[PDB]
Ligand binder design. Structure first.
Ligand SMILES: CC(=O)N[C@H]1[C@H]([C@H](O)[C@H](O)CO)O[C@@](O[C@H]2[C@@H](O)[C@@H](CO)O[C@@H](O[C@H]3[C@H](O)[C@@H](O)[C@@H](O)O[C@@H]3CO)[C@@H]2O)(C(=O)O)C[C@@H]1O
Ligand SMILES: CC(=O)N[C@H]1[C@H]([C@H](O)[C@H](O)CO)O[C@@](O[C@H]2[C@@H](O)[C@@H](CO)O[C@@H](O[C@H]3[C@H](O)[C@@H](O)[C@@H](O)O[C@@H]3CO)[C@@H]2O)(C(=O)O)C[C@@H]1O
Ligand SMILES: CC(=O)N[C@H]1[C@H]([C@H](O)[C@H](O)CO)O[C@@](O[C@H]2[C@@H](O)[C@@H](CO)O[C@@H](O[C@H]3[C@H](O)[C@@H](O)[C@@H](O)O[C@@H]3CO)[C@@H]2O)(C(=O)O)C[C@@H]1O
Ligand SMILES: CC(=O)N[C@H]1[C@H]([C@H](O)[C@H](O)CO)O[C@@](O[C@H]2[C@@H](O)[C@@H](CO)O[C@@H](O[C@H]3[C@H](O)[C@@H](O)[C@H](O)O[C@@H]3CO)[C@@H]2O)(C(=O)O)C[C@@H]1O
Ligand SMILES: CC(=O)N[C@H]1[C@H]([C@H](O)[C@H](O)CO)O[C@@](O[C@H]2[C@@H](O)[C@@H](CO)O[C@@H](O[C@H]3[C@H](O)[C@@H](O)[C@H](O)O[C@@H]3CO)[C@@H]2O)(C(=O)O)C[C@@H]1O
Ligand SMILES: [Mg+2]
Ligand SMILES: [Mg+2]
Ligand SMILES: [Mg+2]
Ligand SMILES: [Mg+2]
Ligand SMILES: [Mg+2]
Lengths: 281, 283, 279, 281, 285
């Protein structure tokens, strides 16, 4: 039960690095950090699709200053997210036409530029007072996924647990396939969406442009804010004094020269969130 | 100028509409293609019968609201009035996939590249009303051959207009007799039926179409946007029989088959949240 | 134009006039399309009216307002707003179009090319026929000479010598007409005249090319206000409301010669009117 | 020094015919009036680029009613342009797929449509109280231009007069390369832009979409006007009682069947300008 | 500490300037002079089979404008600063992008034809900024191990010149490396493919940018003298000019030229005009 604002503010900022699959600059895949592993047409059919091949949501919880010295009291204060500025950094890097290992965009006897990053763009950011609610889906119900222990990603049927002969249901809406975005680099974009049936205490904003050769269209400015207040003037209220931020920013794909397969490329996203104190019952 | 760098009165209803692209249930022989259409080829409907499973259809539902009037003969009645709605197509991220089962490879013949992703025609419409959505029929080709099914799995404009087969070219324009109510889920093909702008006084509908086979799908998703359903007089749809009627169609593109380059449509589920209030009206 | 004085709503459909303008005769199966167009038509043959999409138009008789037309102060119907919609947009998803080119390799069994390419969409509401200005993309295009005429061309009015018809590639002031006949004025030769049309409102868009994705919307929640900057809408002379449109939604490509047909769709109109006293 | 309005009005109409290169329906090139001459990749390198090959700005001066009985008076009247309606006519003609001499858009054994007009669109219009100020540039500083006595067009270096070895400066910003749009069909669009460093007494509006196969996107209506007043509510003031209108409307190109070279196509533009009387010092 | 605006008849001023593009060939002199306003040629394996040169990497343009001196004594506890209120800015020369007779450019036609050249098209990168101090930049690498030429003196500066990561850790620059930060303090020096405006700083600047990628994308550009950008923030305060300096910067890649003989590319940029309106604002010192 939301009461009146207490007149008292604070701002937090943070960066979320992309989780395109290669999620750390370490090991033998280090050079491909910020990209996915290679994806081929029959992957997941004639082999297991790996987590490194599946771009994932980024997320973090920011701890806010503690508000109530006694959690038993009938009236308490909560942090309320009022507005946010957010930005995808590094967009100029997408002009490169000398991408390592990338297909040449010219005739077979030429010496032209590489294909630049282009194709599918999927951009979403969210700010909320608790983890983002996710709804699960499968483009192909019977896609084969790797089983690592511990798991490196989670899939809708890990939660829905349909019998294998019923997994075609996941190509529609399966209500049991729901989860919270509670782990960075774990929930694949191609299987999980913000759940519009929940998320009463979060705000999310997403866009998608598909295809493999589509020009990426991105903007950057520090002159624009997003107001997080709902129709009643109430922003997300931060349970446990935690602010939750999430995003995904697939900016396109790289095409490999030797087999023409692809890797996704993502870019880091900045957040600046402005909060105020709100009394609640 | 120099060059300077020179060197209970209200209620909320929620529901999901699953897509009806043709394969309309994860059952039977076609179970694995639920949420897609059946395969379509250029001569289908000419050198064979076009099947209902090959024709994406409108989704629709009626939600029973709390009953408002004990005596429906009173000259002043209460009705539910739809004021606004939030709606969203879910699963958009799934459209990034370039490992689509049976799909054509987007690369040279000696390569091992990605599959073609879902792309091409996008047809998106949602509607909220106090009675079934009014539909007007049309045909792109008047003489298209349609399968005869018992029980029938779709209905076509000429099942209503009942024109002689030799006059069916009329259906390529506007045939006033070819009208229907969106009264059955997964039954009215998108390619034959549109919202009827000459009726639908008690419904609101919103549609967009981008054609072509290789067009990049362009879709948005957010929980911070609502659609106001009130008309110019401040009146929203009024729910007859205390029923709220929601409808949609969301073709998100096509898949291209590797073995013959024919296509299947792909659709995605749509969520609705409708906010309603009560209005007294003359009876 | 005096003050307003009560209201009424007019509805109608305009069926497309793409060339094959009736579901009768020998071409009846292509009603709502143009006849086939090839690159050299109008050069090594005569371009037919059935090959040239045309404006649709109608005059709706409104309730008579004045007992005596002699009076110095009369009532006129004033068009205030309108809702308009292109119906049948969903039919443009078809990839099983009769006689259409296959969009796949020569060894495949793929879909047909769908309707796509150039879109030309215009609607107008006025108190008198829409004024048109004529033009030619090619001054010397050869047009058939039917009796009676099935279409009218700019030089039919301007009557320039054959050696001067290159003028029609620019602006010929003599090449003016009124949109007074349905399925008669070709879109490729006639445009709404911005130097006239004081008593009409028109709204048009064009996206060219042969393979362009068609981009259309449909909704019953949007209206167009027809009032001008003085708050005055079109005034219906002779108690007649004049509506006109053209909606080329793209082209079909034929499998056997790769030539094209334009495709059009019907348009709906709902016009709201009020009574206005005039001098 | 601008003073108050004098409360008196007038409306001016005119058409500007396109000047794509073939600027009159006369002479040897008369049948291509409203188009450019044919342009090939090496034109201006292994030959001289001709004025007929370079689309130019259209412009006109409209004489307004004389306002002042005596131009020596300390307070005078000027016509002030307040708003304007403008329209490109003939857009429907761009649907044509039977264009004379044009490449066929089908396989070589077919009998399909011609390529329609498509590709780069350059649309600008301007209304001012004096000629539009232009700034010059060259995409290639060493482009070879024909010499006619008298000249049929004027180029930036005709004004800047840089040594031949210095003409690469014209690929950037050369302040000496300035001109007034004082002659119809004379200033090529590819060499001359509205000068944002001047033009205090004009308003111009321009858009460009490039490429050779881009779908042309054009609108037409009589329900929209452009307001010409500046931030202080002052429109262009007509010096010498002359109103100056300018434009360029490249709507795309035609592709010739026999060599695949191109001609630009333009369309005429209509103007309706509304003016009022303003007192000035 | 921002105080109130100081009203008066001489309280505002206006500044105009041009910035020429820095696509790589940054002066019309020397051996590369005929390609001024373009980049040097770029090929797929450059930076791998060879060193990527500064002339191959478009850079931000920038300038500091000296404003009228405001405070005779910078000792005083209360001072005045120029406050940037609005800006008009325009990319000039857009009409030149219609050319289909580009020197050395690939022919857009069949192999035995005589058609037009490919016009400038492809990726467009447009940004402008106005601030009261240099624009803050954040570094990144699309490929951490890209090979760069090391000239003495340096012709450009790269994110790891500042971050100084070990060579085997440079993959970190493909994400967000907080030490990879710089100020846009030198014209024709910071490549756009390695440096973006830093959204974590730039409190005293305003920047506006767009990108449309790909190699064949139609350039889409507007020009008009009837539109301004308001520079005031949510509290109505514009950038405040430290040391009486106005800082402007930009980058305008309008597309690429494709060479006929190897199909490699050069970027093309165009010059940008600025008109900045400023007013006097009192601040606490
Ligand atoms: C998850 C992962 O490590 N993916 C890598 C894949 C897989 O290991 C591979 O596809 C499994 O079969 O391999 C990638 O590299 C391959 C690519 O360079 C292709 C180009 O044709 O060549 C492959 O190796 C060939 C080898 O050249 C032949 O001699 C023969 O032995 O067959 C092998 C395997 O086909 C490379 O492994 C890929 O891009 O697919 C790199 C991925 O990181
Ligand atoms: C206005 C009209 O009726 N147009 C129809 C045209 C014309 O009759 C024709 O183009 C005039 O020359 O014809 C269309 O049908 C033609 C198409 O099927 C092509 C495919 O190659 O074949 C044509 O017939 C050939 C015939 O096959 C040859 O044996 C020989 O007789 O020549 C004729 C004409 O070239 C069809 O006429 C068309 O698409 O052009 C149908 C139009 O409705
Ligand atoms: C400014 C002008 O008049 N341009 C015309 C050009 C030039 O006269 C020409 O390009 C200068 O060399 O010519 C155009 O017409 C040419 C075109 O039809 C090509 C098609 O291949 O043929 C040319 O003539 C050829 C002839 O066919 C050959 O047999 C041989 O004689 O060589 C000549 C010259 O190449 C036409 O001149 C053109 O489009 O380039 C028409 C322009 O209006
Ligand atoms: C409604 C439905 O079930 N659609 C099927 C269609 C139809 O059954 C078929 O098109 C009717 O002719 O078949 C689909 O599969 C076909 C496809 O794999 C093609 C690939 O070239 O092969 C077809 O089979 C051939 C077979 O290869 C030959 O040995 C045989 O002599 O002829 C067969 C029939 O053509 C497959 O049936 C299709 O995509 O068209 C699958 C759809 O779900
Ligand atoms: C930074 C710079 O000056 N770049 C040049 C480049 C480089 O000098 C070159 O790529 C280094 O290998 O050269 C450019 O021109 C080349 C281009 O014209 C190609 C066309 O095939 O030919 C190259 O020279 C060839 C020569 O023709 C061969 O006979 C010889 O055996 O090898 C030479 C090197 O490949 C030109 O150098 C280029 O566009 O790459 C011009 C740039 O300004
Ligand atoms: Mg809910
Ligand atoms: Mg009605
Ligand atoms: Mg007039
Ligand atoms: Mg100035
Ligand atoms: Mg900060």
């Amino acid at each position: 039960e939301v009461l009146n604002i207490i007149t008292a503010t604070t701002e937090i900022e943070l960066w979320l690095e992309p989780r395109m699959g290669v999620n750390a600059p370490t090991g033998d895949r280090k050079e491909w950090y910020g990209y996915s592993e290679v994806i081929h047409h029959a992957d997941g059919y004639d082999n297991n699709l790996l987590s490194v091949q599946m771009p994932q949501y980024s997320c973090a919880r920011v701890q806010l200053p503690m508000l109530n010295t006694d959690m038993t009291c009938e009236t308490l204060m909560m942090w309320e997210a009022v507005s946010c500025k957010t930005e995808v950094v590094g967009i100029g890097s997408l002009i490169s036409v000398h991408l390592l290992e990338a297909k040449m965009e010219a005739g077979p006897n030429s010496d032209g530029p590489s294909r630049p990053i282009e194709g599918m763009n999927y951009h979403m950011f969210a700010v909320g007072g608790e983890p983002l609610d996710l709804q699960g889906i499968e483009s192909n119900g019977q896609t084969k996924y790797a089983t690592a222990i511990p798991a490196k990603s989670i899939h809708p049927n890990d939660i829905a647990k349909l019998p294998e002969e019923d997994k075609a249901q996941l190509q529609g809406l399966v209500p049991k396939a729901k989860a919270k975005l509670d782990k960075d680099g774990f929930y694949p974009v191609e299987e999980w969406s913000p759940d519009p049936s929940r998320n009463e205490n979060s705000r999310y904003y997403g866009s998608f442009v598909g295809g493999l050769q589509t020009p990426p269209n991105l903007q950057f400015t520090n002159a624009v804010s997003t107001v997080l207040l709902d129709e009643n003037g109430v922003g997300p209220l931060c349970k446990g004094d935690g602010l939750f931020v999430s995003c995904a920013d697939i900016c396109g794909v790289l095409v490999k020269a030797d087999n023409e397969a692809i890797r996704y490329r993502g870019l880091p996203r900045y957040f600046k969130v402005t909060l105020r104190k709100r009394a609640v019952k």
